[PDB]
Amino acid sequence: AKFPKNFMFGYSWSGFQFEMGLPGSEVESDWWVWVHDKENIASGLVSGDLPENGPAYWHLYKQDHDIAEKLGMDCIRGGIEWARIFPKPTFDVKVDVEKDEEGNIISVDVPESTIKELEKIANMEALEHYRKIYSDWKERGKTFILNLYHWPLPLWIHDPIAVRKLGPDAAPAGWLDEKTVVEFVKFAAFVAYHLDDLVDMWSTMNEPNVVYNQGYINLASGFPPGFLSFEAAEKAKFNLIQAHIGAYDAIKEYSEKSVGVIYAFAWHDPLAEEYKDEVEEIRKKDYEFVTILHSKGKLDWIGVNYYSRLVYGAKDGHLVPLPGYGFMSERGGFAKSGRPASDFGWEMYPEGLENLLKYLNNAYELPMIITENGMADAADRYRPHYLVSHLKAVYNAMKEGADVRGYLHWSLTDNYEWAQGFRMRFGLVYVDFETKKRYLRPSALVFREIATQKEIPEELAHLADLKFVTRK
Amino acid sequence: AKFPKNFMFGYSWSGFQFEMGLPGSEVESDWWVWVHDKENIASGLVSGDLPENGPAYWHLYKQDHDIAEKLGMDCIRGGIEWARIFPKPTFDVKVDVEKDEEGNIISVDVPESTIKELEKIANMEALEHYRKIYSDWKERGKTFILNLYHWPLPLWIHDPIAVRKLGPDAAPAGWLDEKTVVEFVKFAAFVAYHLDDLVDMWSTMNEPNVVYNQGYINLASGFPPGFLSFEAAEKAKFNLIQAHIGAYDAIKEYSEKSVGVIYAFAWHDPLAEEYKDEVEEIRKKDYEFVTILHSKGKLDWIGVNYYSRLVYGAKDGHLVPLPGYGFMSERGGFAKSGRPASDFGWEMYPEGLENLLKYLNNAYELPMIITENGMADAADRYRPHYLVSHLKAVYNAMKEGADVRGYLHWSLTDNYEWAQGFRMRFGLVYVDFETKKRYLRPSALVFREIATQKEIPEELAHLADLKFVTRK
């Protein structure tokens, strides 16, 4: 199974989960305060692990890029933290965001004179440090994809503890406040103005669906601000659509490069034929955020984040996602299919990725990059099979016409998994968080073989076959 | 953890388990008849899998040696099947084996004229075919260790079905018949006379302890001839000691190379301090076969086959090996230590190998080669940890003085595991037994890195740490 000559192999990172770990890298944000919050820790809503004990990529990026380059990687999708670049509010620096009566952003203008007003309140040292990180990769002749938003917001934008206690009208309320979108536009323009020379492709945001659904509906997730409101979820979703559009327009003012979005795509399956039509509607609804962006002519490419599936059946006269399949499988166990489940309880289901890419190709006809795919597997028992089987899924979808430009694993290294902390280890490379030392897992060597040869060679082909990891 | 420049890395094979699989390779022996026996299959004593559906190394050796060479291996210990070389009886060809009154072989002479008598009744085509196999490896500049006996006997030597039914006085009875030793001596001389130019080091036999203990005591093992007699086990043991001594003397008639023995060494541990002295006695007794050979000045080197441990405690006023540890752990599960157990139920216990090598060094002060070490692991979930952790054990023992010359994994490929059949897969390389195709496992890539660099490099060092595979 050979990939095209220019098909990219690499990995993705985020600021919050990778940067901190060593002195001089701490930065406050909503997510910082959230994971440090004593109530959240004591209730078990978050793990008690803290991101400032993480892999210290802020300091150690050159060494990680060395590992990446030796694994045959030629593309990295990374992040830039708003909370770092603008630690103080930008509200008083006015720009032109034009909206229609329905609240759609129709145009933006952040003139050069305003970029210079922004410089004076930005942390330019942090901006230059990001340049050092990105340039260290770029100078090796490699591709860099910069994703503008990967969940943490500045605290002057969102104070989630205050929102959960007093309500969103009483405190800075994140994506529930219209003006957050306008401040994000200023940030997007600022970043593009300065960093376009280091960036090959842009993404406005990562997994906005996770932000709004987990923050305001699925509270067991332990995402900020964690108060239940379907109206709030809808408002944050609406605002995040506009944040994409504004940011797209902001970037295009200062860049000719492609601008896409990175999205969480579960594959949705019916347990039986009778539920097929209902599940087809659930797919449409679940992916509608992307559909909207594509339909407005505001997507040049799609970043596909794929990890697992959801399987649907009836429970008490209602169609629901079922325990024992997909993301709802037993941690460290097996799905009801017999497929192994990751340390996170996510079923190994590469068929989902093949189905998904064919569906997305047909739906949007856009270039796609697999921007995340991986598994929580602290001993590397299953990752090699996960890696090769999902890469074969991508190959198979490409043969049926999907325009896939690369595959980025989640991730190069273990990192801080949000409310779960460090116990979910997604790396091709193990990190000792006490020493910051990096150690290869065997999956890393498998990756290197495939990436260097641009192909799943026949000697590694059996790693796509899940027979010997599947029960019964 | 760097090994010495001439420390050897490689693998081991046996005739019965590897050779057969494709037309033209089938050969009769006691073990052939045993595994084909309808009663044994129906009772579940053997698996019903048949060796003639195996990896077909008789035909495919050049392709497996290619894999081995690319994995950085420079040594193979292989076999030669007595049942192939002498398919008809050799009894009428007389030689001089001198014994003392206590039954010890004091000298052997198999003159050149008698070697030529033997040629006329040998299967010389099989001998030449073995030469093609060994030479294919040797021609690459690599080391070959030839082991003369790896369990199957000619049927004219042993008819195990008839022995189990009618008793050893009523049929050819294998190592219960004194003359088997004399016939083995003829074989050993024949082999050395012809093949010494292809052989770097000799072994007379592999795991003689398994032959006598499993065939005559531990009948649940499904080893031939499978009738219970402590007296028989003692007689087979005594005869196998003499077979080693006879073969050593035979080989030395036609070779200047080192002659050793390959032995199964379980590491024995007390569950608690109160059982320590009893376990020390159990070690002495369990290894006494090797102690005898060394004490007679008939061992130039020791082949250490190490897989796991046995842990001892009191049960019903008796000290016994305990369920839930070592070789007596749950298949596919965990030992009571929390360590993972292989598909065979054998606890991952690298400390055992370190302890063993130090013990053997002190006991015998001989050069040692790890001639087997591996695990039944059909999806490679645990093998990489098993491989690196046991290699670190070897390194650690060498640092304390053990004279270890190389490490040979069991094995390069999946193969026929005796009474268990194909269900126990010990390969760095997976074999599809229907197609005979070989596929690398990630542990093979790990092995390649270590072998090519003569060291466990720091990036692979965490594979020696069993924390993330060990429960609670």
Author numbering:
A (entry chain Q), B (entry chain P): 1 to 472
Paper text:
β-Glucosidase from Pyrococcus furiosus (BGLPf) is a hyperthermophilic tetrameric enzyme which can degrade cellooligosaccharides to glucose under hyperthermophilic conditions and thus holds promise for the saccharification of lignocellulosic biomass at high temperature. BGLPf exhibits high hydrolytic activity towards cellooligosaccharides at high temperatures. The thermostability of BGLPf is affected by its oligomeric structure.
Crystal structural analysis showed that the BGLPf-M3 crystals belonged to space group C2, which is different from that of BGLPf-WT. Diffraction data were improved to 1.70 Å resolution and the structure was refined. Furthermore, the r.m.s. deviations of the Cα-atom positions (1–471) of subunits P, Q, R and S of BGLPf-M3 compared with subunit A of BGLPf-WT are between 0.27 and 0.31 Å. Molecules of glycerol, which was used as a cryoprotectant, were observed in the putative active site of each of the four monomers of BGLPf-M3 and were also observed in the BGLPf-WT crystal structure. The crystal structure of BGLPf-M3 exhibits higher resolution than that of BGLPf-WT and also shows several noteworthy interactions between sub­units R and S. the PQ and RS dimers are distinct from each other, even though the PQ dimer of BGLPf-M3 is similar to the AC dimer of BGLPf-WT. Two types of alternative dimers (PQ and RS) are formed in BGLPf-M3, with residues Arg381, Tyr382, Arg448, Glu449 and Glu459 controlling dimer formation.
